[PDB]
Structures are given as C-alpha cells and as structure tokens.
Write a protein that binds this DNA or RNA. Structure first.
Ligand code: ATP
Ligand code: CA
Ligand code: CA
Length: 1203
RNA sequence: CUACCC
RNA sequence: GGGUAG
C-alpha cells in the first residue's frame, strides 16, 4: 500500500497505460495527475525504444483514393489480435488519411510526424508498433482491391473501371507479379541467368544454338512468368492479362502491391520445445481411463503465458506427476493437452483443420499492467471460435503492493467477459505468480495448484465417444445369402446391441430397420462398442437401397440436411491446395464421412475472392442430403485431391461442358491409326538423325548396339537411349526369338542351383589347412541374420502380416484375381502348409476352403525382353497367403539394416552419388531369385525360419511342357516372400563382405537384386557370390565406370540418363499419346524443349487425329492425353471455378462381385487395420467392384492445375 | 484398371 | 510377385 488505488484508475481510463506503471509513476509524482502523465510521456518513449528487440511480423495494409490518386500503407505490429482491434485501426487509418491530404510518399516523413503518438499506443499495448513502408501511384484511371487486411494492391489503367481495374487488382493480389511487361528487364539481371544457365547447359555438351536456344526459351518463360502480360488472368485464366487489355481497349500504367510482413524474415518459434527449456533451469534446484481435455493458453506476448505453462508443468510435476507445440501435463483426476494460441488466424487453422480443437482456454493476464487493449480480441477469439469455458489467471501479482488495487483489475476483466457473453460474474480468477512457482515458493505454488484445481472442476467431463448417441458411417454394403444385408465400417460413436432398432439415413427418405447381428472377423459378438471395426446385419432391407456415405445411427439422433453454414480452411500453394484462388461459383465435392458429395457454395457478405491459405466463412449447399450435425469434419475434394477442410458451423433451412465434344473425342480415341511397317523403328531412327547419331539399318541392331561409356554426358545420354529404347519391343517381325529361351535359362536356374546345392554340403574341404572366403562370410552372414531375424517368426507378426492379394493363383487366373475371389473360392494349399490353414480355420468362424491339396505350382512365362522372356511361378492361393505374411515381417524387420523396400528412392539416390563419387558401386546378379539354392538358404536362416520357409514354399512345379520339377531353388519368382528373402540374403552377404574388409556394413543398400555397396568390396563380394551359387551380371554391375544404375534410374557423372523403352506394337492413339509423352519428359526441362528432339515430336504429333493434338494435360496426370500446357487446351471446360479436362480411359463393363468373398475380405481388412496438412484421417479405403477390360476407349473427365 | 520398375 | 504414382 502506497498512495490510494482509487484515482490510479483515473490514471488508467484517462491514459490507458499500465496498472503498476501508473501507481509507480504516481508515487513519483506526489498525488498529482498532470505531472504523473508528464512522467509517463517521457518514460513511455523509453519503453517504445525497448521495442526494437520486438520483431514485428503481423500488421495491416491500408489503401485510399481521391479522384484518381491512390496510396498504400504497411503500418504493422507483431500480433493479429492487435491489428484487428479498434486501436491499431484508429492509428493505422489516421496515418492513411494523412497521405490523402498531403501526398506523403516518404516513409521517414510520416514515421516522425506521429512519433509522440506512436509511443502513446505501445505504452498502452506493448508491441513494436512501427510503420514500415508507403508508396503512391498516379495514372489515368486507378482502382484498388483489398484482401481482408493481409494484402492491398494499387493499379492504374487507361480505358478501364471497377469492371476492370478491380479485377486485375484481384489478379495482382492473387498472381503477385513484379513487373508489368516482359520488356521491363535490366539486361544485367537477365544476363545473370543467361550466363549462369549457359554453364548448366554447356557442361552437358549441348552445341551453341541448343544451349542458347534452350536457355533463351526457358528465360523467355522465366520472364514470361513474372510478366503481368503473359500471366493467365485469374478470373478467366484461359487468356493472359496482357491479352485482356489488347482485347480490351485498355492499357495499365503501373501497380503497387503490399503483403504484410514481407521480407521481415526472422526465426519461427515453437511453444512446446521452448517450455522444455523454461522448465529445465528450474529442474536442477493402472488408470488410463481418465478423460482428455484440450486446454489453451491465450493472452499478451509479454504477459508470459509461457512462464505459466511451465509452472503448470513443473509444479504439477511437484505433486501428482508431470499436435506438436503442446505440452501434456497431468492431474489426479484428468489428462490434459495444453496448446498455445498466439495467432488468431493461425488458430482458426487449428479449430477448422482440427489439428487442435478447444475444450476450454486459459486467460493469462499480467496483473502488473492489467488488461491490454487487445484483450478484447483475445476474448473475441474465444466467443468467435466457440470456446466453452474461459479460466482467468493473474500472472505477476507480487508487483502489486495493494489488494484494493488488484480487486479493481478484476473489474477490468470481469466486465470484459460480460461484453462477450461469458460468465464474467461467475468465472474463476487466480491471483498468483508463475515465476515464483518456477522457484520453490510453495506459498505461490498453491496458486498454480489453485488454477490447476479449476480445470478439474469448471471444465466439463468430455462425453466419452462410447456414451454419445449411436452412429456408424456406412462404408460398404453386402447381400449375403442367409444373412440378409450387412454393412461394414468402424462404428464412430455409441453402442449397438443385437436387436436394437436403427435408421439408415443418407440420401433417400431415411428408412428404418432392426439389427439382426453384429460381427467381426474372428468373433461374431452381440454388442458393438464405439471405435471398433464391425459388420452389422439388417433384415427386411436389401443392397439396392443402401448407398455409401449413409449413416447407421439411432433413430431421431441425426437428421439429413443439404443446406448449412460453415467455416473452412483452404490449403495453400505449399499445402497441395489450388495455387489459384477462386470466386463466386466454386463447385467442389464435399467429402463427408466416407463418400464424396458435390455442390455449390456462396460467400458471406462482401468477400469476392478466396485464395489458397485462407480462412473463410461460407454457406454450403450440396446436391443431395447427408446425415449431419455441427462438428462434422468435412474436407474438400477437387477431382480426388483435397484442397480445403472445414467443420459445419450451423445448419440452415435446406433446399458448362460440351457432351458432344467428349463424344467426338471418344470416336477419335478409338481410331486405330495405320503405319507403313514398323512405326517405332521409324520414330527411333528419325530421332537418331535428330541427334546426328547413325540410325538403325536392320531390325537386329535394335537390341545389339552396345553404347560407349565416354564423351559428354550428351554423347552418352542419347547413345544410351538408342541401345535401350527398342529393347522391349515384343512385336519384332524377323525375330527368330522366342519365349522358349526363357525356359532354357530356367533349366540352368536349377542346373547351377543343383551343382551348388550339392557342393555346398561339405564345410570341411579335406583337412585343416585351407580356409575359403565364401564359407567365412556365410558364417558371418548366418550370425548376422539371426540377430536381426529371430529364432522363429513370431505369430504376433505372422498373422498380422498375412494377406490375400494380387491376382493369379493355381486356383484362379488374371480374371479371378481380386482378393475377394480368394475368400469366395477354395484356394489350394500344400502338404506341409496345411497346418497353417487349419490355424486360420481355428482363428475364425468363417469358412476356409481348400480345394486340392497338392505340392504343385504352375510355371509359366511372362513377356520380358525382345530376346527373352521370364519364368514366373503361380503359387497356390494359401501358400501365397502366408508367404506374403512372412514377407511382411521379413520386410519390416529388414529395415533395421536400413533397407527400405517400399521406398526405392533411397537406392537410386545412391546410384546418383556413385555416378560421381565412384565409391558406391551398383551390382546386378544374373538370375536372382532363381539362383538362391536350398543349401544357402539353409545355412543362413535360423532353422525355425528355415522351416517356415520350407512349409510355405512350393517344392514341386508343373510346366506347360507337362513335365514336373522339384525345386532346387528354395523359391522362385512370384513366390510370396522371395523378394524379401533375396534382399536379406544379399544384404546379409554384402555386410559380411564389409566387416571382413574393415568397412561400414551400413554403407550397404539392397533392393532385391539391385544391391549397392562400397566399390572396394566388389571383387570380394563377386567372389563370395561365385561360391554361394549366385552369378554377377558383368554388364549390369558397375564399379569403375562414370555410369551407375539402380531401381530404374540411370546416371552418368551425376546426370540423369534414364532412357525409355518402346514396348508393344504402337497402333491405337493411346499407344502414341504415351510414346510422345515419354519422349516429352526425356527431352524437356520445365516446358522447354530440347530443339533437336522437338522435331520428331511435332512430326509424329501429326500422326494423331486432329482433336487429339490440341488436347493437352499437365505432366503427372497420366497418358489419357499428350502432356502440354493445359492453359491452351480448347477442350478444357471451366466448370465451378475448377478446370476439368477430358482424357483417354480404358473402357470397362462391370461384372458381378462375389458378395461372400468381398464381405469376408472387407472384415479381413478391418482385422489387419486393428492389429497395425495433418488431416488425411478423414479418409478410408474403397468398396469392392470388379470391372473387365473391354477393348474400347472411353473418355473420363478429371481435375487439373497450372504448374 | 493405367504408367514406371526390381 | 513386389515398390511406386494414377
Ligand atoms: N514377375 C516377377 N515376379 C517376381 N519377381 C520379380 C518379377 N519381376 C522382377 N522380379 C524381381 O526383380 C529382381 C531383379 O530382377 P532382374 O530384373 O534383375 O532379373 P533377374 O531375374 O534378377 O536376372 P536378370 O539380370 O537376368 O534379369 C529379381 O530377383 C526378381 O525377384
Ligand atoms: Ca539380376
Ligand atoms: Ca538390377
């Protein structure tokens, strides 16, 4: 207690300065008003000077006009909550009508014209509130569109009005150009990349007018990009903006554009990581059913929320026990989750996207300075995002020496909540100190315990998903004979006992039905708990009247609507979302629960444009109803990819393309073109002359030309494609070639495998003198294997890796290949493998069928090269089921040696390095899987595994030749585990070749046979392989060359020399659309052609039908049309503010699916699920339908994008 | 169901 | 068979 706290508020609501900074400036003023504020005047600029270490990121932008005189601004702070308040506005605006009176176009002028006032806010707020930049533009006619407050633009035209100047200002605000025309270039900034890319190109070995033409062409695009001229006008992007003016009378002069916090940079701060350090300095001085509550900390930046959250961490660790960027502190009764919410806009991208919803936020306010002017925006953020309960806490209460003064700070927060319809009179307010609590002051540590004691009561217990009224999203439908109709999908909320009545609501009049039975895979239970994958039976209702996306809920719990209001976040350019904004008639599909549903929207009053990376309110009105209530996390699919997300906010009352064109295209799509002889050979020959290289003369040289390994990377890249492009051309006329040669090698695949299987059974050679290198690695391999593998494949990882998948089995064929035609049909087992199948029968109540039991598998031949074929082996369906099982555990486990099989990036990436480093060598064996003998497989594997590999393998096979064979090879190609085993075998050996030669085994990577190791180890590894059966492919193992290849990426001195093969006889336009495309990608860098190859491209582009030349799609979307600039495409229909394009699609007539097998497969998937920006967890797998490939070509419409 | 590939 | 984009 000092002087009276009465007229200290007189020093507040006459100034607005800090709480204690009044009384302390009043104690040094001797009970006077004036001279106290005269202190604050000078001792407030000192504080303003302290604001230099406060980096300002947020801000506003302001614009204003008079006649035809425009002006922009960039006055900015460091928080959203400030910029949106009625205070930063009163200042920012007032310094923008100061630029109207006088054309103040010099930042330094107005920066000082308001300095005595600029401090009057920071003393009242406490942020580095400083004006940044200002500029004005004059011209004939000038308009200005402003995006909310984040971006403002000024553009001056000539022949235009609000119908135009606003629209292109919307383009300046959207497409962000830096110049007006391709002419606006400093020759220095141009001859920068004209000289910097010359090296790029000339180093590769491109003649003058190649590299020059390419670079000029690329920079012609590079300049074209920033060119406001050549830039697809945002509103109608078919045409460039420069094209719009010429078509329009008009001609713009110039343009100004500001985005807040542009070039500000600085370093991003993460709340969660930091508090770990706030806690650390203070450190050194059963019941898992407890509810989860999402709390958040909201308040001033300098009021130390981050100090409080540390106290609520460490003091909560002193008693009971202690999305990223959130802490996870506990309490005796509950389990919390505590986020920091500093950005208004970057919290709506958390409530909406659901990355961090809210169950009740905590209101941190320093008691030394009371509530700040921007507190009414914090509290606003609460009652505008729908936070249930707000808990207030006075931080730093020791700085007040009078409780009569502290009581009066409550009057400034209790009434600040009453204005925002919060229980101000009945809200909890803890007066404490966090900094004191970080120390050991338990007198103050009771305050954190007082606050933490209020989350335990004031905040309501979250209705555990079990207790919420029943609901199950229908994910699929099956009509089983003897089961009526069953639907599946993980039940979202509630319990379903068998017999209870439910409602099927989705699109049709909501129908009602009783639950006959609820079941899983292994169990056929009776009650269905929430958050479990099940299948519920329905009586008196069949398949025809249950669509997907429908829900299966308790009657009268959830109603179907089609017109609601909602808020959505749009994914930015750097989030996969559309790198183009959209306007009024945006028509996407709203992916709800399981199904997708199209529909229109609208904008709330006054917004006309929304960009990628925005929050926005809207009124969604979809096509046909879906069952809903507020809180449905719905995403926003555009053509199968999601570009938005959102939550339904409140639900309301409820309520161009050329078809002829696609039919024209479809007709030409089926047009079979015709060529005088071999088209491919001509395309490839006429391509060789495009490169100076000598063309093929006969049809033999297509697969007998050996490329030289020297010259520029250009002298190689094309000389290499020559040798490779033809290789797989199956239709070779005078080819005396066969598929029988494939069998001839398969003979040696066992003949070699026999000679090794036999000889690899005598570890003692004759006596004890000699010591071989092969045996040595085997010994080491063997020990290495088992430390990584185990004694026997645990049934834990056995059952939950086995799966029915692929196509062909000895029982089935390519037609009956889907996983549903495996549960439906009786698949064949094998003598030893029976015991497993029986276990599966004992694993469930469903039917497990074995037709024959035989130890045979069909040996066939799949097309491979033009000089040879393959010899894959079709395995029995039950062996394959378990083979894929072990291959999944023997895969995941093979990741500890750093080998990733479902990511072959990490193997062609190291083929890159080796093409330069010359230390990494790529190795290819000759017949990988077929050369792996039973002998070697036996010596290495643990005998437990070596049995699980002997039970599941097919020991005998039957050829087309009638003749049978017993497999010397432990397993052939097509076998359900061989790929993993061969990877592990080779990797095992490769590592043993490393440690034996004093070298890192962790420098070894193996992808099947595509193995990569230290170059030194090569002659050892090669001699190891000579022993252990295998044989290296001199032609495809590279150790000393400038060239390396791996996982289908070839490299020459770090340059990309990946060729492309011409495969089947080119005939239908589909085959030529594709070929042109590969040659497009192989010869282009960002829409810029290699001129030489561009000739034969345009030349054979003529071969295609008329319409089938102007039909282009951006690369990455397939080969349904030629790849080109889609901005061009005539066919491209702009529907619903989204570009739609027609492309060639293989035509299919549907076939009836095995309802039995598909259902059994559907609940088998939901057993392998259970035992196994940040929101693709709103999506799931598709239902089962079979479609036979006809022969026709249909045309499907898809979604596309710019670049 | 369509490219690429071990 | 298997990876990987549609
Ligand atoms: N249809 C297939 N079924 C099973 N495995 C296959 C198939 N196609 C390729 N592979 C796998 O790719 C690996 C590498 O194949 P690669 O193309 O090197 O043929 P290779 O059989 O190893 O001998 P070659 O060098 O003579 O082709 C093989 O070990 C094999 O396991
Ligand atoms: Ca090989
Ligand atoms: Ca290989």
């Amino acid at each position: 207690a000092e002087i009276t706290a009465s007229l200290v508020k007189e020093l507040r609501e006459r100034t607005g300065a800090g709480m204690m900074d009044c009384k302390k400036a009043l104690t040094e003023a001797n009970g006077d008003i004036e001279l106290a504020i005269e202190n604050m005047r000078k001792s407030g600029a000192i504080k303003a000077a302290k604001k230099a270490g406060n980096v300002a990121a947020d801000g506003v932008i302001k614009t204003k006009i008079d006649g035809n005189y425009g002006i922009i601004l960039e006055v900015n702070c460091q928080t959203d909550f400030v910029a949106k308040d009625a205070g930063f506005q009163a200042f920012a605006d007032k310094v923008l009508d100061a630029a109207v009176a006088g054309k103040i176009t010099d930042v330094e002028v107005l920066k000082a014209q308001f300095e005595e006032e600029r401090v009057a806010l920071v003393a009242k707020i406490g942020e580095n509130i400083n004006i940044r930049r200002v500029a004005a533009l004059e011209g004939d006619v000038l308009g200005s569109y402003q995006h909310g407050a984040r971006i403002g633009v000024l553009v001056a035209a000539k022949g235009a009005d609000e119908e135009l100047v606003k629209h292109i200002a919307m383009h300046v605000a959207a497409s962000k150009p830096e110049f007006i025309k391709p002419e606006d270039v400093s020759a220095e900034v141009v001859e920068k990349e004209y000289q910097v890319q010359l090296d790029i190109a000339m180093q590769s070995g491109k003649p003058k007018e190649i590299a020059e033409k390419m670079v000029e062409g690329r920079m012609k695009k590079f300049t074209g990009e920033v060119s406001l001229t050549g830039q697809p006008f945002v509103m109608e992007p078919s045409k460039t903006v420069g094209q719009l003016l010429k078509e329009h009378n008009a001609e713009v002069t110039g343009f100004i554009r500001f985005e807040v916090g542009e070039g500000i940079e600085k370093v991003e701060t993460d709340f969660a990581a930091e508090v770990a350090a706030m806690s650390k300095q203070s450190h050194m001085s059963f019941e898992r059913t407890k509810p989860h509550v999402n709390v958040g900390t909201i308040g001033h930046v300098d009021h130390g929320k981050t100090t409080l959250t540390a106290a609520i961490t460490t003091v909560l660790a002193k008693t009971y026990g202690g999305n990223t960027s959130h802490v996870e502190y506990d309490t005796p009764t509950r389990h919390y989750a505590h986020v920091d919410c500093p950005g208004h806009a970057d919290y709506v991208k958390n409530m909406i996207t659901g990355a961090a919803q809210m169950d009740g936020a905590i209101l941190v306010v320093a008691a030394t300075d009371g509530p700040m002017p921007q507190t009414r925006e914090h509290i606003l953020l609460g009652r505008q995002v729908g936070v249930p309960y707000i808990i207030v806490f006075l931080n730093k209460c020791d700085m007040v020496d009078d409780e009569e003064l502290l009581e009066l700070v409550e009057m400034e927060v209790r009434e600040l909540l009453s204005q925002y319809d919060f229980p101000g009179d009945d809200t909890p307010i803890v007066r404490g100190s966090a900094l004191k609590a970080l120390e050991g002051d338990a007198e103050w540590e009771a305050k954190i315990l007082e606050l933490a004691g209020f989350l335990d009561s004031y905040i309501p217990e979250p209705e555990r998903a079990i207790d919420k009224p029943f609901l199950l999203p229908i994910e699929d439908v099956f009509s089983i004979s003897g089961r009526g109709t069953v639907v599946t999908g993980r039940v979202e909320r509630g319990i379903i006992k068998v017999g209870e009545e439910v409602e099927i609501v989705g699109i049709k009049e909501t129908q009602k039905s009783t639950c006959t039975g609820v079941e899983m895979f292994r169990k056929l239970l009776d009650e269905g708990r929430a958050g479990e994958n099940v299948g519920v039976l329905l009586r008196g209702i069949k398949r025809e009247e249950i669509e997907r996306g429908q829900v299966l809920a308790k009657p009268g719990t959830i109603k179907p609507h089609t017109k609601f209001e909602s808020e959505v976040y749009i994914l930015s350019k750097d989030e996969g979302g559309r790198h183009t904004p959209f306007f009024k008639g945006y028509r996407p599909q709203f992916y709800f629960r399981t199904t997708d549903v199209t529909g229109t929207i609208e904008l709330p009053e006054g917004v006309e444009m929304v960009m990628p990376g925005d929050n926005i309110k809207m009124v969604v009105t979809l096509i046909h109803p879906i069952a809903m209530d507020d809180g449905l996390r719905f995403a926003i699919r555009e053509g199968g990819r999601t570009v938005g997300a959102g939550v339904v906010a409140k639900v309301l009352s409820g309520a161009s393309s050329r078809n002829s064109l696609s039919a024209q295209l479809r007709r030409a799509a089926n047009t079979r073109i015709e060529v005088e002889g071999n088209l491919a050979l001509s395309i490839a020959n006429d391509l060789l002359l495009a490169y100076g290289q000598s063309p093929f003369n006969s049809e033999a040289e297509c697969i007998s030309f050996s490329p030289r390994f020297d010259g520029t990377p250009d002298d190689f890249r094309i000389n290499y494609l020559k040798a490779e492009i033809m290789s797989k051309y199956d239709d070779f006329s005078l080819g005396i070639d066969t598929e029988a040669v494939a069998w001839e090698k398969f003979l040696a695949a066992e003949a070699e495998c026999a000679l090794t299987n036999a000889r690899l059974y005598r570890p003692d050679y004759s006596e004890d003198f000699n010591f071989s290198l092969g045996e040595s690695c085997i010994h080491m391999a063997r020990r290495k294997i088992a430390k990584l593998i185990g004694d026997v494949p645990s049934v834990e990882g056995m059952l939950r890796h086995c799966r029915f998948s692929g196509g062909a089995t000895t029982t089935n064929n390519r037609s009956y290949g889907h996983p549903s035609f495996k549960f439906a049909l009786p698949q064949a087992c094998t003598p030893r493998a029976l015991k497993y199948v029986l276990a599966l029968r004992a694993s469930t109540h469903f039917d497990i069928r074995i037709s024959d039991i035989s130890p045979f598998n069909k040996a066939v031949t799949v097309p491979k090269n033009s000089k040879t074929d393959r010899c894959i082996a079709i395995e029995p369906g039950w062996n394959m089921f378990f083979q894929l099982g072990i291959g999944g555990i023997l895969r995941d486990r093979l990741r500890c040696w750093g080998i990733d099989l479902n990511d072959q990036t990490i193997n062609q990436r190291r083929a890159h390095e080796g093409s330069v480093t010359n230390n990494l060598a790529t190795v290819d064996l000759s017949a990988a899987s077929d050369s792996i003998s039973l002998a070697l497989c036996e010596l290495l594997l643990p005998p437990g595994w070596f049995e699980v590999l002997m039970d599941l393998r097919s020991p005998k096979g039957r050829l087309p030749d009638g003749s049978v064979v017993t497999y010397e090879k432990i397993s052939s190609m097509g076998n359900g585990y061989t790929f993993e085993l061969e990877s592990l075998i080779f990797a095992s050996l490769a590592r043993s070749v490393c440690e034996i030669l004093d070298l890192d085994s962790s420098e070894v990577t193996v992808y099947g046979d595509d193995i990569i190791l230290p170059s030194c180890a090569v002659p050892a590894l090669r001699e190891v392989f000579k022993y252990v059966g295998f044989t290296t492919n001199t032609k495809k193992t590279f150790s000393e060359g400038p060239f390396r290849e791996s996982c289908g990426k070839h490299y020459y001195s770090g340059v990309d020399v990946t060729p492309f093969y011409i495969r089947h006889r080119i005939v239908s336009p589909a085959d030529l659309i594709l070929v042109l495309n590969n040659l497009y990608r192989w010869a282009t860098i960002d829409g810029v052609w290699d001129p030489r190859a561009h000739s034969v491209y345009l030349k054979y582009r003529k071969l295609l039908p008329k319409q089938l030349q102007r039909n282009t799609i951006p690369d990455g979307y397939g080969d349904g049309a030629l790849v080109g600039s889609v901005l061009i495409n005539p066919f491209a229909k702009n529907r619903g503010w989204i570009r739609y394009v027609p492309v060639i699609t293989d035509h299919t007539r549907d076939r009836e699916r095995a309802e039995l097998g598909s259902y059994l497969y559907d609940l088998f998937s939901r057993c392998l699920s259970e035992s196994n920006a940040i929101d693709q967890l709103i999506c799931r797998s598709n239902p089962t339908k079979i479609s036979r490939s006809t022969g026709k070509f249909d045309i499907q419409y898809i979604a596309c994008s710019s670049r």
